[PDB]
Structures are given as structure tokens and as C-alpha cells.
Amino acid sequence: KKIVLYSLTTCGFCQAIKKMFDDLAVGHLCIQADELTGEEKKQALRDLRKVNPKCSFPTVVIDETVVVGPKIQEIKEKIGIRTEVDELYEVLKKKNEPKGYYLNGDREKTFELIRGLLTNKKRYGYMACPCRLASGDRNNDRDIICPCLYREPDVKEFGSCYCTLYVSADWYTGKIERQEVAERRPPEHYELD
Amino acid sequence: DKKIVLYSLTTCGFCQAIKKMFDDLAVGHLCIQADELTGEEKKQALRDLRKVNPKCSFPTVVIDETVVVGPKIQEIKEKIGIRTEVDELYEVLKKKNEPKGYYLNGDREKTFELIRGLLTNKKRYGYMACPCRLASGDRNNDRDIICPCLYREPDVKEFGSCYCTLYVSADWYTGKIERQEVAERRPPEHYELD
Numbered sequence: 001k002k003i004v005l006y007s008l009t010t011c012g013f014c015q016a017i018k019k020m021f022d023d024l025a026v027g028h029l030c031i032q033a034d035e036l037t038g039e040e041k042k043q044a045l046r047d048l049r050k051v052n053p054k055c056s057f058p059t060v061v062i063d064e065t066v067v068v069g070p071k072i073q074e075i076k077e078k079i080g081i082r083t084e085v086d087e088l089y090e091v092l093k094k095k096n097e098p099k100g101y102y103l104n105g106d107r108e109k110t111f112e113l114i115r116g117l118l119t120n121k122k123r124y125g126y127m128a129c130p131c132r133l134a135s136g137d138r139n140n141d142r143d144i145i146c147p148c149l150y151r152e153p154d155v156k157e158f159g160s161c162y163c164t165l166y167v168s169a170d171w172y173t174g175k176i177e178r179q180e181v182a183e184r185r186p187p188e189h190y191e192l193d
Numbered sequence: 194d195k196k197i198v199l200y201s202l203t204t205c206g207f208c209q210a211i212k213k214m215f216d217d218l219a220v221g222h223l224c225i226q227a228d229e230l231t232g233e234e235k236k237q238a239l240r241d242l243r244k245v246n247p248k249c250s251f252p253t254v255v256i257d258e259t260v261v262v263g264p265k266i267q268e269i270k271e272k273i274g275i276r277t278e279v280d281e282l283y284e285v286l287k288k289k290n291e292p293k294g295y296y297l298n299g300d301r302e303k304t305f306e307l308i309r310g311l312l313t314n315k316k317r318y319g320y321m322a323c324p325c326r327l328a329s330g331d332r333n334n335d336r337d338i339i340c341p342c343l344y345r346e347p348d349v350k351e352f353g354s355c356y357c358t359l360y361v362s363a364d365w366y367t368g369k370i371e372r373q374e375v376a377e378r379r380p381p382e383h384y385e386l387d
């Protein structure tokens with residue numbers, strides 16, 4: 001697959017697409033159009049205009065298909081990128097949505113939280129809460145294995161769990177204030193002394 | 194000169210963002226990635242953490258005798274004495290735009306990076322050309338894309354955010370509306386390619 005990424009050093013999403021490519025050892029050509037001369041900029045825009053008439057950044061060309069804008073799932077779909085986070089995202093969505101627990105709509109935040117669940121599943125053997133420190137002992141951590149014991153009262157009182165991974169329909173659609181959620185876990189559960 | 198300790202988790206996103214700011218501003222600190230430590234070292238880092246934050250929550254930053262619990266980057270910066278040209282411009286943009294109904298994106302990290310882009314563009318061009326667009330460097334050719342651009346008002350009225358997602362409406366901010374992708378509204382003929 002021949003990939004070209006039209007990018008700008010000042011464009012945050014352009015750098016995130018580039019980062020994903022580098023991390024997954026994807027073979028691509030990145031054009032940081034703003035680092036070019038006045039005439040090279042004109043030529044980069046003419047090349048871009050042929051595949052994206054709006055001359056907008058980011059734009060990804062994969063062989064003969066073009067993905068315009070911050071459409072990370074569509075870019076992944078044309079390149080053939082499938083990770084265990086994508087798999088777990090689908091599983092969690094199917095299981096939780098009928099229960100009224102929606103995954104946070106900020107996809108980039110939810111994806112890093114799911115990556116945290118996976119990192120915890122590998123090192124501990126269970127999906128310990130990604131925004132808490134686990135002990136590594138399953139029995140001590142039983143109340144913070146996701147979904148934790150605190151999700152139900154936290155979502156009922158504030159509209160979201162402690163990591164903001166699961167949110168209610170009201171939190172999702174802004175019908176309630178998106179309040180900060182305090183740590184409900186009894187501090188004694190660490191068994192420090 | 195201040196003694197700084199950041200209690201962090203490798204699985205905590207904001208923890209790495211606080212650490213990134215420290216490193217980029219030469220702020221010396223101890224970073225404890227509590228989850229990388231052994232079983233008994235986890236209990237001791239939690240004992241040190243518990244003394245300053247009984248709830249044993251991450252992130253937690255200790256600056257001398259003052260403790261900041263949670264993702265409170267502004268509070269951390271005020272206690273250390275961090276005050277950058279981005280902070281200055283953020284305040285100027287906030288005071289000028291909030292009374293008009295144009296709020297700065299609540300994802301404070303993304304807003305700061307956009308403001309850094311505005312500053313990078315002011316330095317290399319002489320004006321704050323839109324950081325998510327390609328500037329020519331000719332003010333007259335870029336006139337419609339000097340921040341705030343000619344397209345902010347129609348984009349925010351129709352989608353709730355400007356093209357870069359720097360300025361958002363109150364409904365976008367609180368989640369009352371869907372946060373849709375904003376397409377490039379600029380007529381491509383303005384680029385004067387041929």
C-alpha cells in the first residue's frame with residue numbers, strides 16, 4: 001500500500017495519524033506542507049487538490065482511495081488496521097449500551113482508557129481500572145475490576161464513572177452537568193496498615 | 194528550587210501530559226509511576242501518597258508543602274510560577290471571545306497546542322494565520338484565514354465549532370449538540386493555484 005499523508009506541523013490530528021503509522025510500522029510518505037517554500041507550497045496544494053478539491057489537511061491517500069479529515073476509523077478501514085482495542089471497544093459497546101452505560105463520545109479518550117484496560121489485563125490477568133493503582137492481587141482488587149463496584153452509584157449520582165469511560169444518556173447528550181467524579185473507593189481497601 | 198513529586202500511573206493520560214509540561218519547561222521533579230513499582234514498593238508509594246491525599250488518587254502533585262490533587266494544570270502552574278506566552282494569549286482570547294458566545298475548547302491540552310500554533314504562525318508570518326490551514330505568507334492572500342477567520346461564524350452557527358475546533362459554542366461545550374466534523378468551507382480558488 002502506497003500511503004501519502006498531507007500534513008501541517010501546526011495540525012494536531014495530522015501528527016496523531018503520523019504517530020499511529022510510525023507505531024504500527026506502516027510505510028508512508030508525510031508532507032509537512034508548511035515547511036516548504038512559497039512555490040513548493042503551491043505544488044503541494046495542486047497535488048492535494050487533485051485528490052481533495054477542498055485543499056484541506058489532513059488528507060490521506062492510500063493507493064487510489066482518499067480519506068479527508070480526522071476520520072481515523074475510515075483510514076484504519078482502508079489500510080487494514082485492526083487492533084485489540086478496536087475489538088474490545090465493540091465488545092464493551094454491545095454489552096453496556098442495552099444497560100444504559102454509553103462509552104464516552106470523545107473517541108480518543110475512550111480508546112486510551114480501553115488501551116489501559118488491555119495493559120492491565122496482560123500484566124494482572126484482569127481488567128483492573130485504568131485510572132486507579134491496582135495491587136496485582138485479584139482479591140484485593142476485586143472492587144476495581146472494570147466495570148468496578150463504584151460505576152453504578154457514580155453514574156447514578158454524577159452521570160459518569162470515575163474514569164469517565166462510561167456515561168449515562170443524560171451526560172452523553174448534555175442534559176445534566178458533567179460533574180467531576182470523586183474517588184468513592186474506601187481508602188482502607190489498599191490495606192497499607 | 195521547589196521540591197516537586199508527581200504521583201502518576203502509566204495508564205493515566207493526564208499524568209503524562211503534566212510530566213510533558215514539566216520536561217518542556219525544564220521543571221525538575223520526581224515522577225513516580227506507581228504501577229511500575231513492585232508489590233511492597235506500591236504500598237510505600239501509596240503510604241507517601243496517602244499522607245498528602247488520603248483518597249490515593251492519580252494524578253497528585255506535591256510542590257514543597259502544597260498539594261494539588263487531580264487534573265488541575267492551572268493550579269500546578271500557579272504554584273510553580275509557570276507563566277508562558279501561551280498562557281497570556283489564552284487569557285486574552287478567553288476575555289475577548291466568551292462574551293460573544295465563542296468559548297475555547299474545554300480540552301485544555303488541545304486548546305494550548307492550537308494557541309502554540311497561532312504563535313508559531315505570528316512569528317513566521319507576522320499574523321495569526323489559522324493553525325489547521327496552509328498559509329501562503331502573503332497577508333492579502335491569507336486575509337480570510339487570520340484568526341478569527343471569516344469562516345468561524347458560519348461554522349460555529351452550523352456545527353457548533355470552528356474548523357480547527359479552537360472556538361466552540363456553549364452547546365458544543367456542554368454536549369447539548371453532536372460534535373460534528375467541520376469541513377473546510379474556504380473556497381479553494383482563494384489559494385490562487387492556477
Ligand code: SF4
Binds near residue numbers: 145149151162164166
Ligand atoms: S471507574 Fe470506570 S473505567 Fe474505572 S473500573 Fe470503574 S467502570 Fe471501569
Ligand code: SF4
Binds near residue numbers: 343
Ligand atoms: S478555523 Fe478556528 S482556529 Fe482556524 S482561523 Fe478560524 S477561528 Fe481561528
